[PDB]
Design a protein around this ligand. Structure first.
Ligand SMILES: *[C@@H](C(=O)O)[C@H](O)C(=O)N[C@H](C(=O)NCCCCCCCCN)C1CCC1
Length: 212
C-alpha cells in the first residue's frame, strides 16, 4: 500500500456534511463509506441519504445514536436512496424508503477491520473509505483547527466518522460537523504512536461495505 492515500483526490468523497444537533454520526460515517465504494466500483460520485439510514435502521436509535455496522448492513440488504431523493432533516422520522421509489445503490455486504490494528485499518483505507469511531467528547478534539491532531484524548469512543486517507504520520478523517470545523471539515489524526487503541480510540471499531 502507498505512503499516501487521499480519497478526495481520487474523487471518491462528497462534500463535507453537518449532522447538526442530531446524534446521527453513525449514519453520516456509513454514508461516506457508501459514496466512496460506489465511486470506486462504478466511476460515479453520488450523495446518499443519511436520513434514510437514520429513519430506517431499526437496529440503531435515530438521533440517540446508532451503529455504522447496522447502517451498512441495511444498505447491503435493501439499499439506499440518493440524498436528493431522501434529504437530511436532523430528526428521526418514520421510514420512508417504501414511498421513495427504487433504491439508488445497494451493496453486497459489510466487513469489519481487525480492531486495534493500525496496519489493518490503513490497508482498508488504501482500498476504500472506512467507517471508524473515535472519542470526540474532548474539548481538544472539539476545538481542533488544524494540523496533525495528537490529542489529548482518551479512547472512550463516542463519535463515528470516516477515514478517507492517511500519510506517514496520520489518518485523514472526514467528520460530519460541517466545513467550518478542523481542516475544512477534515482532521488528520496522528498515527504510528504504538498505542494499540489508536489516537482517540481510532482503531476501536471500523467497518466498510463490500460491493462486488
Ligand atoms: C454519534 C454522534 O456524535 O452523532 C452518536 O452519538 C453515536 O451514534 N454514537 C454511537 C453510540 O453511542 N451508539 C449507541 C447509542 C445507543 C443509545 C440510544 C438509546 C438509549 C440507550 N440508553 C457509537 C458509534 C460512535 C460511538
Amino acid at each position: 500500500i502507498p505512503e499516501y492515500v487521499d480519497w478526495r483526490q481520487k474523487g471518491a468523497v462528497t462534500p463535507v456534511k453537518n449532522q447538526g444537533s442530531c446524534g446521527s454520526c453513525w449514519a453520516f460515517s456509513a454514508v461516506v463509506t457508501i459514496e466512496g465504494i460506489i465511486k470506486i466500483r462504478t466511476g460515479n460520485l453520488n450523495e446518499y441519504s443519511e436520513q434514510e439510514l437514520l429513519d430506517c435502521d431499526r437496529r440503531s436509535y435515530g438521533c440517540n445514536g446508532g451503529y455504522p455496522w447496522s447502517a451498512l448492513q441495511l444498505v447491503a440488504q435493501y439499499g439506499i436512496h440518493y440524498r436528493n431523493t431522501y434529504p437530511y432533516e436532523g430528526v428521526q422520522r418514520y421510514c420512508r424508503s417504501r414511498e421513495k421509489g427504487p433504491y439508488a445503490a445497494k451493496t453486497d455486504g459489510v466487513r469489519q477491520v481487525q480492531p486495534y490494528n493500525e496496519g489493518a485499518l490503513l490497508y482498508s483505507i488504501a482500498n476504500q473509505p472506512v467507517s471508524v469511531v473515535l472519542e470526540a467528547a474532548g474539548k481538544d478534539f472539539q476545538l481542533y483547527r488544524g494540523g496533525i491532531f495528537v490529542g489529548p484524548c482518551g479512547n472512550k469512543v463516542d463519535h463515528a466518522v470516516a477515514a478517507v486517507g492517511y500519510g506517514p504520520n496520520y489518518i485523514l478523517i472526514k467528520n460530519s460537523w460541517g466545513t467550518g470545523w478542523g481542516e475544512n471539515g477534515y482532521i488528520r489524526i496522528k498515527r504510528g504512536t504504538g498505542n494499540s487503541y489508536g489516537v482517540c480510540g481510532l482503531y476501536t471499531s471500523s467497518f466498510y461495505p463490500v460491493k462486488n
